[PDB]
Amino acid sequence: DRSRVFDILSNINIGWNLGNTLDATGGGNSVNAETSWGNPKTTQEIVDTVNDRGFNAIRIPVTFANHLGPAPEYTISADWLARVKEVVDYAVNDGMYIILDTHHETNYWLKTDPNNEAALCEELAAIWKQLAEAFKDYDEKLMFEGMNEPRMAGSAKEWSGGTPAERKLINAMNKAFIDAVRATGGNNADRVLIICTYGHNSDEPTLKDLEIPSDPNIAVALHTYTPYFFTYVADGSYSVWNGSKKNDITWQYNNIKKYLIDKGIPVVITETGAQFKENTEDIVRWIGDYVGTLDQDGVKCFIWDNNIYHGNGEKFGLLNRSLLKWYNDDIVDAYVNHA
Ligand SMILES: OC[C@H]1O[C@@H](O)[C@H](O)[C@@H](O)[C@@H]1O
Ligand SMILES: [Mg+2]
């Protein structure tokens, strides 16, 4: 009976990611990591703006690696832990639903070598112990997402759900995360804990190998930027959305239904979105078909927002943070008015 998790999640309209911010990896062991990829320092007003628009849930991606002391304690630098808490507190002040993750640990120590299971699980646990202790007294609207796209960067199946041995390591790492957090007690005894597949990938073999914990206060996170050739820029990509490719979404969603939804396991899409390709109308239609698909089973999503829109890079930006105005009100309306 996982119903408590379903009830909590039903309160989300739709979510938003503070992308390329606390997850950025420049600046070393410094709070300046936050601004190292060109975003401004986050403020209460940025977060208010997101909330006021209708994204009443926020994912706060955070990369810890360069702020950790040495093994085996892996102590999170006090400055960094305090800045992370300040940022979460912006959302708490506004009554938002919140996901805190670990993020580009995958550039650093989180490399899914099944022969290194103990060192990986131990680091993951040590980090989460400290985070769980710090946010112990936060209420049930704060959720923890243990890993982000855990994988072996550079490997052949990096983006296709890994190998069977790697999928088994992910199960062990998910378990370690849950264990470390539950052991701190307080509100962490039943806080929603969001585990993931390999690479947050949703292909059938990857779902099939996912161990479902007996803990009743968990959800499964996936990233479905689907279809890839619409949302990303690549050889074969297109900017037009007429519905002919809706079946890529449906087929993929049918496996999420088979292994998760129809087994009563809560699922959350913790990242999705479409890069802006001077195709407003197309993106508005894609959101209808993509989010319309998740709405059939009350599945919630969090849209990736890296504040890149006019400039070079992946143009997932929605809020112009420095002006506190939305880059594209029609795309944003389709998200916040999806229901
Ligand atoms: O351009 C903004 C940022 O996008 C990221 O995905 C890249 O890794 C960063 O190097 C880059 O600075
Ligand atoms: Mg309690």
Side-chain angles (χ1 to χ4, degrees), residues 1-234 236-339:
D1 173 34
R2 305 169 172 283
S3 65
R4 173 172 179 271
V5 175
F6 286 115
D7 299 332
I8 288 170
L9 290 176
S10 61
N11 298 289
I12 291 165
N13 181 15
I14 183 163
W16 186 90
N17 279 263
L18 190 70
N20 281 15
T21 305
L22 305 172
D23 46 314
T25 66
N29 186 19
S30 166
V31 297
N32 298 325
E34 186 177 356
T35 52
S36 68
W37 285 357
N39 281 318
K41 181 173 182 202
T42 309
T43 62
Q44 177 76 64
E45 297 85 346
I46 291 171
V47 175
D48 296 346
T49 306
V50 169
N51 189 45
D52 292 342
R53 199 67 157 81
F55 297 96
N56 65 322
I58 176 164
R59 192 165 176 264
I60 297 168
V62 185
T63 304
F64 289 94
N66 288 340
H67 316 274
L68 298 177
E73 292 88 358
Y74 295 113
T75 297
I76 305 170
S77 174
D79 60 3
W80 181 248
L81 174 56
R83 173 60 184 160
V84 170
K85 184 172 282 196
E86 264 199 302
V87 178
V88 166
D89 285 355
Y90 297 151
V92 179
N93 287 345
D94 292 2
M96 295 172 84
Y97 292 84
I98 309 171
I99 300 173
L100 174 64
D101 81 10
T102 76
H103 210 76
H104 292 302
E105 305 320 319
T106 42
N107 294 8
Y108 291 95
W109 61 271
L110 210 177
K111 305 279 197 191
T112 44
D113 177 350
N115 303 317
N116 190 35
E117 170 179 315
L120 292 166
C121 290
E122 286 171 24
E123 176 160 6
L124 190 59
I127 289 162
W128 273 110
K129 178 166 192 274
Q130 294 170 79
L131 296 174
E133 271 149 1
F135 296 96
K136 195 201 290 201
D137 292 347
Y138 285 58
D139 75 23
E140 85 289 342
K141 300 199 171 88
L142 173 58
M143 307 187 278
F144 293 161
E145 177 176 9
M147 306 179 280
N148 188 73
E149 296 178 351
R151 64 195 192 279
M152 177 70 76
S155 72
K157 297 180 99 300
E158 174 176 1
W159 297 113
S160 71
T163 68
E166 279 181 299
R167 286 189 297 266
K168 160 149 190 203
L169 170 57
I170 292 299
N171 294 322
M173 295 189 69
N174 284 328
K175 186 179 321 199
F177 152 64
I178 291 165
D179 192 282
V181 174
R182 293 307 181 214
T184 56
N187 295 358
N188 297 329
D190 55 4
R191 181 178 313 291
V192 185
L193 307 184
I194 304 174
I195 66 167
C196 61
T197 54
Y198 193 98
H200 277 70
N201 170 268
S202 75
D203 302 342
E204 170 156 18
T206 322
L207 293 168
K208 171 167 261 143
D209 289 343
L210 181 69
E211 184 181 320
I212 303 301
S214 54
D215 189 304
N217 294 294
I218 64 93
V220 177
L222 305 173
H223 293 171
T224 50
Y225 294 83
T226 308
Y228 174 77
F229 283 148
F230 182 71
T231 53
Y232 278 76
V233 174
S237 70
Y238 51 91
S239 73
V240 166
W241 188 268
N242 76 350
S244 63
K245 297 278 86 174
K246 185 174 169 164
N247 273 321
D248 298 349
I249 295 175
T250 310
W251 177 77
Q252 173 176 74
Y253 188 77
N254 284 348
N255 294 329
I256 293 169
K257 248 180 100 78
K258 164 173 294 233
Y259 290 90
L260 300 177
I261 299 158
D262 291 341
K263 294 187 191 313
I265 312 299
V267 180
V268 191
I269 308 306
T270 60
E271 280 179 30
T272 185
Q275 298 178 36
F276 180 66
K277 298 166 166 188
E278 304 278 13
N279 62 334
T280 300
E281 298 63 45
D282 293 288
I283 297 181
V284 166
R285 285 185 284 280
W286 170 79
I287 291 167
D289 285 338
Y290 174 86
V291 185
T293 296
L294 306 176
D295 290 345
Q296 291 166 302
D297 299 84
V299 173
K300 308 298 164 168
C301 64
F302 289 68
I303 300 308
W304 184 254
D305 189 334
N306 61 3
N307 200 24
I308 298 176
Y309 187 86
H310 303 290
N312 287 320
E314 297 174 1
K315 288 173 171 50
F316 280 122
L318 301 162
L319 178 60
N320 183 330
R321 299 185 196 168
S322 295
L323 307 191
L324 305 172
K325 297 294 204 215
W326 300 85
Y327 290 113
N328 193 307
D329 276 316
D330 291 333
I331 286 167
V332 171
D333 288 354
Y335 278 133
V336 305
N337 300 323
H338 72 105

